[PDB]
RNA sequence: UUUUGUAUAAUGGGUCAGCGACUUAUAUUCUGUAGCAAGGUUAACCGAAUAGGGGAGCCGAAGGGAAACCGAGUCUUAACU
RNA sequence: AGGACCGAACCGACUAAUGUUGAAAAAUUAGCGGAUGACUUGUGGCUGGGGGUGAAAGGCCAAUCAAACCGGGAGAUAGCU
RNA sequence: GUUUAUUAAAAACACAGCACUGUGCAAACACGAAAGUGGACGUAUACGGUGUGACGCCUGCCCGGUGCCGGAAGGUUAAUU
RNA sequence: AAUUCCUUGUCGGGUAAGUUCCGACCUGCACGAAUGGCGUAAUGAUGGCCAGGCUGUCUCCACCCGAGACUCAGUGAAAUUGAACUCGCUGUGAAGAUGCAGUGUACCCGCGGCAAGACGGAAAGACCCCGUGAACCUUUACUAUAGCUUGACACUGAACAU
RNA sequence: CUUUAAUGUUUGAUGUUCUAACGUUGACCCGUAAUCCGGGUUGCGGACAGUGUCUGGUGGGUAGUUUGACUGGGGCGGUCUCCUCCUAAAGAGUAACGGAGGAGCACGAAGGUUGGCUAAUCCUGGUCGGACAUCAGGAGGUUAGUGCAAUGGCAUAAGCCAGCUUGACUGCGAGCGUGACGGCGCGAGCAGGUGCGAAAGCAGGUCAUAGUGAUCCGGUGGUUCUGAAUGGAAGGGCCAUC
């Protein structure tokens, strides 16, 4: 049978032009008053999945 | 029984030693207070982190009436 | 513990707000600092409202 | 994706975005595709009848990729600034 | 066989003969090899036809952005050195 | 007269020895309790498994019982040997 | 008298007797998706449930807690509207 | 004390001598009134203790009568078993050795006996811990649920009075 | 606008009475050789009882399951995240149910800047006034101080006092530190707009190192995004926040 994609994982990653993945940063959903603007500002643009993880991510998204 | 606690180590200390070639930005020392004082072309952060303000080479020296230790960037 | 959370609101009608904390027992005085609203791109009055 | 009990990566990260139903029925077209059609006109329909775009595409744009070297007229497509000048350099016109 | 470590007084086998354990299907990625190459390849089905037909489709030649959208650029911001 | 008394058949099972790959998957030998009664026994019938039946021991329900047996889900699952 | 058929026969279970409580008869209660049936071809001197256990002398104080029985002024409270 | 931890409590009796027994005391670790209290004739293959009688139970065993054991003839099992040319001692070593080191002893092979060892045979320890194993049991653990119960609408109507 | 009264009248609430639904495990008749059932006659009950649907209570009667880990065996006790010192062997890091202590905040000033200022403690003299209050002098030299532990800092003070103020700004960020990762930390300089200072300059919270919680699912405000025939809308995205 066709492999099934891990559906939660496909809502947290998009693949890029050289076959990396971009995700939103953690820590920016609630409890914000006590966080500094600097910290929050840097946490706002999307990031690239690191090399340790990138095996775990491809397993989950075979049709990405 | 009343003991058994400790905190996580902060990796403080010298990151760049005398003569090393650094780029503007690079951290030189991490410290608590000014065990070292910023000299020429060196800034001091809000946790007393000393960093190079200009590309060049790290230089330590003792100077002043208190015999304090200073860190400077020779712009070699 | 005791310090509540509040929002300071632009006077420039933009909507934009900052957030901060306040001891209401000791200092119950609607706090009015002056901050930079970036929707009109000028410093204006901000006035304590409720979170 | 199981890591032994540690909250896995695809769960300690937040979800983001929404999918567009428009993007599905949209297409791009290369300059190397303009000769491929029969007729020297490029409409949405000629593209579909030359099997350049699928039968359910409603909007198409021409981008600067490859090269046109034959006069063509292009009706109803959007065209990028760069691709526009390429089509014109051949001696082709861009109606709507 | 299991272990840091077994002549071990730790495990298993009285002996012989026969049988007894990494397979199959379908997807996906990488390596080798073959064909064709900015293209490659068809599925069901038609066909007596391992031929021939069938290009529905799939993959690739363009990306960026949550998205509208723009496009060799794009997003970010009022604007980027 | 009697859930009276002594005591065979009949119904039991307190002690000891033997036996423990037995003569026997619970017996034999010597003694032991009841023996007109809530007694004992033949033939047939009824109660069916989270159910029965139990002067109650979780006892018994075909040498199987804190949930019978037989077939099916079934190649349950086994981070263990 | 009864009991762990097969390591326990007993001080355990049962028992006559005693008390509390339920039950007015299409009884309570029990087996039944139901129809029905047991209770009982009985009717409160009867029937079910619970504890205690011949007989003798007796069975003290506590209703705050938990259950049950009675109350219904007020507080809180469902579907519905 | 079928209850007493301390405890073989203390005093009395029984015995040459009695952690048990019988009678008392009260300091009841931690009795007590129908999950009954205290008594009680009779009854008991019921628990504890003491006497007479009787005895191989014992001092301390002896002899005898039978059935095996032993020999001959016939028939003919079993558990177990990596392979064996299968001794002692003192050391050593997966730390308790027929098998290693040193040494001592020992001609080859049966039969009747005995059980010190082969960590002897039998049952993948029942104790103990572990597994995000199991079952069944309890409850004011959680979630449900049959049963019992409340109300609303339906089957379900009429007349009067307030 | 009627404070409010009567009559009709749509309707509820309460009881009385009635019979025709419905009950009858009362009597009698027939099917009928029948203590079943049905039909019939009569009596008694009667919109009650009872049953369906919906609903609150109760419910170990029955069912499915949960009931942590570390641990000189397990259990009991203690512990589980974060900060500081030591152990730690003069770079970083480094274990034990090793030795000692803290945190789960507080501050619109206790933040920014400008101007100014220097501690503890003892002695001598001095109304109440005492070992210790406030005053004057001397010695002293940080033995003080730091909103709260410990360590490292601190006089150009980071310690103490005043005036004016909101940089406890918004967008970004060369480069570097620390982590397996998620992440966390430091940062010169650009752009916009501020405060203090004559100015040079300084300021993106606080002497520094604790004061903390991923994701999901929801809430609130904003929004040149999306909007299942089309215009809207609902919902979704994005930015701020709970
Ligand atoms: Mg958000
Ligand atoms: Mg430390
Ligand atoms: Mg700074
Ligand atoms: Mg966990
Ligand atoms: Mg096509
Ligand atoms: Mg071992
Ligand atoms: Mg060896
Ligand atoms: Mg050994
Ligand atoms: Mg051996
Ligand atoms: Mg063993
Ligand atoms: Mg072995
Ligand atoms: Mg083996
Ligand atoms: Mg073996
Ligand atoms: Mg090839
Ligand atoms: Mg008799
Ligand atoms: Mg007798
Ligand atoms: Mg007799
Ligand atoms: Mg007899
Ligand atoms: Mg006799
Ligand atoms: Mg007798
Ligand atoms: Mg029979
Ligand atoms: Mg069954
Ligand atoms: Mg039991
Ligand atoms: Mg049996
Ligand atoms: Mg079961
Ligand atoms: Mg199955
Ligand atoms: Mg199996
Ligand atoms: Mg008897
Ligand atoms: Mg019997
Ligand atoms: Mg027995
Ligand atoms: Mg017996
Ligand atoms: Mg009992
Ligand atoms: Mg009935
Ligand atoms: Mg009793
Ligand atoms: Mg009361
Ligand atoms: Mg009373
Ligand atoms: Mg009540
Ligand atoms: Mg004793
Ligand atoms: Mg005496
Ligand atoms: Mg005595
Ligand atoms: Mg006594
Ligand atoms: Mg008692
Ligand atoms: Mg008691
Ligand atoms: Mg009483
Ligand atoms: Mg009582
Ligand atoms: Mg009694
Ligand atoms: Mg007594
Ligand atoms: Mg007697
Ligand atoms: Mg007896
Ligand atoms: Mg006796
Ligand atoms: Mg005697
Ligand atoms: Mg023979
Ligand atoms: Mg040894
Ligand atoms: Mg030895
Ligand atoms: Mg030797
Ligand atoms: Mg021999
Ligand atoms: Mg023997
Ligand atoms: Mg053995
Ligand atoms: Mg085992
Ligand atoms: Mg249960
Ligand atoms: Mg299950
Ligand atoms: Mg379980
Ligand atoms: Mg444990
Ligand atoms: Mg070190
Ligand atoms: Mg070192
Ligand atoms: Mg280690
Ligand atoms: Mg440690
Ligand atoms: Mg301060
Ligand atoms: Mg100053
Ligand atoms: Mg004085
Ligand atoms: Mg002075
Ligand atoms: Mg000091
Ligand atoms: Mg300051
Ligand atoms: Mg960079
Ligand atoms: Mg000025
Ligand atoms: Mg501080
Ligand atoms: Mg949910
Ligand atoms: Mg629109
Ligand atoms: Mg629409």
From Swiss-Prot, chain A:
Q: Which GO terms describe its molecular function?
A: structural constituent of ribosome
Which controlled-vocabulary keywords does the entry list? Ribonucleoprotein, Ribosomal protein
| One BP term from GO | cytoplasmic translation
A Gene Ontology term for the protein's cellular component? cytoplasm
SUPFAM superfamilies the record matches: L35p-like
UniProt keyword annotation of Transport present: no
Assembly and interaction partners: Part of the 50S ribosomal subunit.
Q: What is the official name of this protein in its record?
A: Large ribosomal subunit protein bL35
Lineage of this protein's species?
A: Bacteria, Pseudomonadati, Pseudomonadota, Gammaproteobacteria, Enterobacterales
Gene name in the database record: rpmI
From Swiss-Prot, chain B:
Q: Name one GO biological process term.
A: cytosolic ribosome assembly
User: What are the protein's GO molecular function terms?
Assistant: ribosome binding; rRNA binding; structural constituent of ribosome; tRNA binding
Domain of life of the native organism: Bacteria
Annotated Gene Ontology cellular component terms: cytoplasm; cytosolic large ribosomal subunit
The UniProt entry, under Gene3D superfamilies, shows: 2.40.50.100
Do the record's keywords include Ribonucleoprotein?
yes
Q: Which gene encodes it?
A: rpmA
UniProt lists the family membership as follows: Belongs to the bacterial ribosomal protein bL27 family.
Q: How does it assemble?
A: Part of the 50S ribosomal subunit. Cross-links to the 23S rRNA. Cross-links to the A and P site tRNAs.
The name on file for this protein is: Large ribosomal subunit protein bL27
Query: Which keywords does this Swiss-Prot/TrEMBL entry list?
Result: Ribonucleoprotein, Ribosomal protein, RNA-binding, rRNA-binding, tRNA-binding
Q: Which InterPro entries match?
A: Ribosomal_bL27, Ribosomal_bL27_CS
Curated annotation (Swiss-Prot), chain C:
Q: Note the superkingdom of the native organism.
A: Bacteria
For this protein, the record's Pfam families field holds: Ribosomal_L33
PROSITE patterns this protein is in? RIBOSOMAL_L33
Q: Which UniProt keywords apply?
A: Methylation, Ribonucleoprotein, Ribosomal protein, RNA-binding, tRNA-binding
One cellular-component annotation, GO: cytosol
UniProt GO MF annotations: structural constituent of ribosome; tRNA binding
Matches recorded under InterPro entries: Ribosomal_bL33, Ribosomal_bL33_CS, Ribosomal_bL33_sf, Ribosomal_zn-bd
Please list the GO biological process terms of this entry: cytoplasmic translation; response to antibiotic; ribosomal large subunit assembly
Record text on subunit structure and interactions? Part of the 50S ribosomal subunit. Cross-links to the P and E site tRNAs.
Further notes on this entry?
Surface exposed on the 50S subunit.
The UniProt family comment states:
Belongs to the bacterial ribosomal protein bL33 family.
Q: Which PANTHER family match?
A: 54S RIBOSOMAL PROTEIN L39, MITOCHONDRIAL, LARGE RIBOSOMAL SUBUNIT PROTEIN BL33M
Q: What is this protein called?
A: Large ribosomal subunit protein bL33
Lineage, broadest ranks:
Bacteria, Pseudomonadati, Pseudomonadota, Gammaproteobacteria, Enterobacterales
Q: Gene name?
A: rpmG
UniProtKB/Swiss-Prot annotation, chain D:
Name the family.
Belongs to the universal ribosomal protein uL15 family.
Q: Does the keyword Ribosomal protein apply?
A: yes
In UniProt terms, what function does this protein have? Binds to the 23S rRNA.
Set out the biological process GO terms recorded for this chain's protein: translation
Tell me what this protein is called: Large ribosomal subunit protein uL15
Q: Name one GO cellular component term.
A: cytosolic large ribosomal subunit
- Record key words, sorted: Ribonucleoprotein, Ribosomal protein, RNA-binding, rRNA-binding
Q: Which domain of life is it from?
A: Bacteria
Citing just one GO molecular function, the answer is: rRNA binding
List the lineage, top down. Bacteria, Pseudomonadati, Pseudomonadota, Gammaproteobacteria, Enterobacterales
Note the subunit structure. Answer: Part of the 50S ribosomal subunit.
């Amino acid at each position: 049978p066709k492999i099934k994609t891990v559906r939660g994982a496909a809502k947290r990653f998009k693949k890029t032009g050289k076959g990396g993945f971009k995700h939103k940063h953690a820590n920016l959903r609630h409890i914000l008053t006590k966080k500094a603007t600097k910290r929050k500002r840097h946490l706002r643009p999307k990031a690239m999945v690191s090399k340790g993880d990138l095996g775990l991510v491809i397993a989950c998204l075979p049709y990405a | 029984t009343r003991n058994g606690r400790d905190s996580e180590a902060k990796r403080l200390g010298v990151k760049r030693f005398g003569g090393e070639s650094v780029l503007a930005g690079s951290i030189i020392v991490r410290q608590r207070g000014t065990k070292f004082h910023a000299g020429a072309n060196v800034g001091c952060g809000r946790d007393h982190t000393l960093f190079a303000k200009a590309d060049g080479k790290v230089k330590f020296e003792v100077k002043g009436p208190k015999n304090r230790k200073f860190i400077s960037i020779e712009a070699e | 513990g005791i310090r509540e959370k509040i929002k300071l609101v632009s006077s420039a009608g933009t909507g934009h707000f900052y957030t901060t904390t306040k001891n209401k027992r000791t200092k119950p005085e609607k706090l009015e600092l002056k901050k930079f609203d970036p929707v009109v791109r000028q410093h204006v009055i901000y006035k304590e409202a409720k979170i | 994706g199981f890591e032994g009990g540690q909250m896995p990566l695809y769960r300690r990260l937040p979800k983001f975005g929404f999918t567009s139903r428009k993007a599905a029925i949209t297409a791009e077209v290369r300059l190397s595709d303009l000769a491929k059609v029969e007729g020297g006109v490029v409409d949405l329909n000629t593209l579909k009848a030359a099997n350049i775009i699928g039968i359910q595409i409603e909007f198409a744009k021409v981008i600067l990729a490859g090269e046109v070297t034959t006069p063509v007229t292009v009706r109803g497509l959007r065209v990028t600034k760069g691709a526009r000048a390429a089509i014109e350099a051949a001696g082709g016109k861009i109606e709507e």
